[PDB]
Each structure stands twice: as structure tokens, then as C-alpha cells.
Design a protein around this ligand. Sequence first.
Ligand SMILES: CC(=O)c1nc(NC(=O)[C@@H]2CNCCN2)sc1-c1cncc(N)c1
Ligand SMILES: CC(=O)c1nc(NC(=O)[C@H]2CNCCN2)sc1-c1cncc(N)c1
Length: 130
Amino acid sequence: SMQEEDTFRELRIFLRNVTHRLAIDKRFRVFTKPVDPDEVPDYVTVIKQPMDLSSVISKIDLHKYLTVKDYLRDIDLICSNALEYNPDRDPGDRLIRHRACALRDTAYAIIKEELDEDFEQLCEEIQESR
Ligand SMILES: CC(=O)c1nc(NC(=O)[C@@H]2CNCCN2)sc1-c1cncc(N)c1
Ligand SMILES: CC(=O)c1nc(NC(=O)[C@H]2CNCCN2)sc1-c1cncc(N)c1
């Protein structure tokens, strides 16, 4: 229905705004673009489902997120990929792990503070009806 399409449009506007706020944060620049196979050749040895904030923006605009849970699954994938590719005590690893956890925590905190729980519940019930 028209009311349901309005609901998903509001979700997309909200998700673009959150994603922009993550992408301009200096701490998260490592997560703003895909990893380059020439710059990093061993990345695909470890990571089978790459994700980054530019890909998240593309998916919003392709209407791939119908709930905030769908969106947070990809935020969590950015974080879990970073943790798996950076598991060692090396300071470079540890810095990326710290930023990855901060990205996830920041996204969850924005949503907890700013997304109405009844709005998210409506998104879920529309999705469940399709
Ligand atoms: C600082 C750091 O590198 C770090 N590493 C983590 N490692 C891990 O989560 C995993 C889990 N079991 C240990 C090895 N593998 S959590 C974490 C972290 C700590 N406090 C604040 C923030 N933002 C991040
Ligand atoms: C996305 C990610 O997780 C990532 N991790 C890295 N880790 C390291 O370089 C660790 C690996 N262990 C040895 C010490 N260096 S570089 C990197 C990255 C690569 N190309 C483009 C972007 N934007 C980020």
C-alpha cells in the first residue's frame, strides 16, 4: 500500500542519515570503501563476504533494507570481517579492531536513541507480510 511504501521510504532516509554520520567520522575511514585486491591480496583468503559503508549506501538505494535489523546485519558484517582479518597482537590489527568495535557500538547507539521502536516494529510487520 501507499502507507507501507511511505514507511520504507522513511526508513531509507533514516538509514542514509546514520550511514553518512558514520562515514564522515575520521575513525571509520578504513570502512568507507571496499578493500582493493591489488593493495591487499590476502584479504579474500580470509573474508568471503566483503562489506563497507559505500556498499551499504548502494544497498539502501536499491531498497535492500526493509528493517533496521537488515541494516544492522551489514554493519555487524563490517565489524566481524575486520575482527577476523585483524586477529593478531600487531598494533595495526589492534587499531582496526578498536575502530571496528567503535563503528558497531556507535551505529547501535544512534539507532537506540533515535529510531522509534514502534516504527521499527511496523517495518518488521510489513516485511513479515510479504
Ligand atoms: C581495543 C581492541 O583491539 C579490541 N579488540 C577486541 N577484540 C575482540 O573483540 C576479539 C575478541 N576477543 C579478543 C580477540 N578477538 S575488542 C576491542 C575493543 C576494546 N574496547 C573498545 C573497543 N572499541 C574495542
Ligand atoms: C578493511 C580492513 O580490515 C583492513 N585491515 C587491515 N589490516 C592490516 O593492514 C593489518 C593486517 N595484519 C597485519 C598488519 N596489518 S588493512 C584494511 C584495509 C585494507 N584496504 C583498504 C581499507 N580500507 C582497509
